[PDB]
């Protein structure tokens, strides 16, 4: 039974799971894009959310410094995480990253997905563009909204 149980299983235990999560977070902070299975993808996204929150809490804080040092073994990535990814998103609240599913792999045929912070400099991924506003149903809804506005 696993009712209301969060955090899935990955490696040979919680230690290996957190190690893989830290490695993926470091690789993402380095390249800003990684292909991982959907489970690990969402786990890394949820972890990077709190990581960005901590980085935004403050740089002089010792707790945030320790968290960054423990979650970034590359060392050289902590200054970047603190002085590039923190001020750039100083206007947003908690909405960061971007989840997009990859079709399939070539060997094990895994359900991979993409991860990347909003903005950045890498090319933009083909986001799922919704239907245009000049279609039939869209025009009908626009006319209905106009009629409702004219009524009141």
């Amino acid at each position: 039974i696993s009712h209301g149980r969060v955090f899935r299983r990955m490696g040979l235990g919680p230690e290996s799971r957190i190690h893989l999560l830290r490695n993926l977070l470091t690789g993402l902070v380095r390249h800003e894009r990684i292909e991982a299975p959907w489970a690990r993808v969402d786990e890394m996204r949820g972890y990077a959310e709190k990581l960005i929150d901590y980085g935004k809490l403050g740089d002089t804080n010792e707790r945030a410094m320790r968290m960054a040092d423990f979650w970034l073994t590359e060392k050289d990535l902590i200054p970047k995480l603190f002085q590039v990814l923190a001020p750039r998103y100083k206007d947003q609240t908690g909405g960061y990253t971007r989840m997009l599913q990859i079709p399939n792999r070539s060997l094990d045929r895994a359900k991979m997905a993409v991860i990347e912070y909003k903005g950045n400099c890498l090319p933009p991924l083909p986001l799922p563009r919704r239907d245009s506003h000049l279609t039939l149903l869209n025009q009908l809804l626009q006319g209905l909204r106009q009629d409702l506005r004219q009524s009141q």
Binding site: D131, T135, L137, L141, R145
Partner: protein, 300 residues
């Protein structure tokens, strides 16, 4: 190809449609509020051999409740969300009445259900637990069933889906002692033993075996009510209710022998705020329930 409403809509029409649906639902609820102001059908008095309509609430959680005798009594919380009558069918045994529960969005529903709910002035509901009633009590469909239907000092039976444990083994599905762990177990620590003797070349139907535990409808009898809230529409049922938090439950009247004629002071059809009744306070307390804000009791 399978399509959905949130597909061919732009980023400027989704919130507009959401607000439109919310406003329509609110208007329908406001119109269905006042029941007696339309056609409440003939209201008959209470009789010995008759029943009344129940409720469909939401099991919030559990909290303790003390009494003047200085004892602890477990009490649950059932929120009566909406809860309205859908239809009514007479005599193939006794008169029935359909009642709704929690509200559900009108997008992931069937076409027949959508049409049936459009024919009436209410939105679609989640579950539909039909109750048994006599011909004496008959309220027009669509009327609201507030939480004031029940009163303190009455036994109520609750039934709903239990917390399913999945395809569990035997020790959890039936409480078997099973084999020990040593002297001299090697492959048996939670498995069962024999099945049905030896000469029996088959297995007797109904033999306790591993399977899906829970996730079934179970009824409870002998649960007393201690308090009823009129503002938030909450019920205080003693004991535990089968199910999980925020789970729809079926509420009605008890069937015990000693608790079959005490429905004299209770309303025969349902609670009608449009009175001719005088509004009730924040909540009605029992004679043995220690109300909050009162001084510390003393046995002197």
């Amino acid at each position: 190809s399978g399509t959905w409403w949130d597909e061919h809509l732009s980023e400027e029409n989704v919130p507009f449609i959401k607000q439109l649906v919310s406003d329509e639902d609110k208007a329908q609820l406001a119109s269905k509020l006042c029941p007696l102001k339309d056609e409440p059908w003939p209201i008959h008095p209470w009789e010995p051999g008759s029943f009344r309509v129940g409720l469909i609430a939401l099991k919030l959680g559990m909290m303790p409740l003390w009494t003047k005798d200085g004892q602890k009594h477990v009490v649950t919380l059932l929120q009566v969300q909406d809860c309205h009558v859908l239809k009514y069918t007479s005599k193939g045994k006794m008169a029935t009445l359909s009642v709704g529960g929690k509200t559900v969005s009108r997008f992931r529903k069937a076409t027949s259900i959508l049409e049936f709910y459009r024919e009436l002035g209410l939105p679609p509901k989640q579950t539909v637990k039909i109750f048994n009633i006599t011909d004496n009590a008959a309220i027009k469909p669509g009327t609201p069933l507030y939480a004031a239907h029940f009163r303190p000092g009455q036994y109520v039976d609750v039934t709903a889906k239990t917390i399913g444990k999945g395809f569990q083994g035997v020790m959890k599905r039936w409480g078997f002692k099973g084999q020990p762990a040593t002297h001299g177990q090697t492959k048996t620590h939670r498995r069962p033993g024999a099945v049905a003797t030896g000469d029996i070349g088959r297995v007797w139907p109904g033999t306790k075996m591993p399977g899906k535990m829970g996730n079934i409808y179970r009824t409870e009898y002998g649960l007393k009510v201690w308090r009823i809230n009129t503002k938030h529409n909450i019920i205080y049922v003693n004991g535990s209710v089968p199910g999980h938090k925020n789970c729809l439950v079926k509420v009605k009247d008890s069937k015990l022998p000693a608790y079959k004629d005490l429905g004299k002071n209770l309303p025969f059809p349902t609670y009608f705020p449009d009175g001719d009744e005088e509004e009730l306070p924040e909540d009605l307390y029992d004679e043995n329930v220690c109300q909050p804000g009162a001084p510390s009791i003393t046995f002197a």
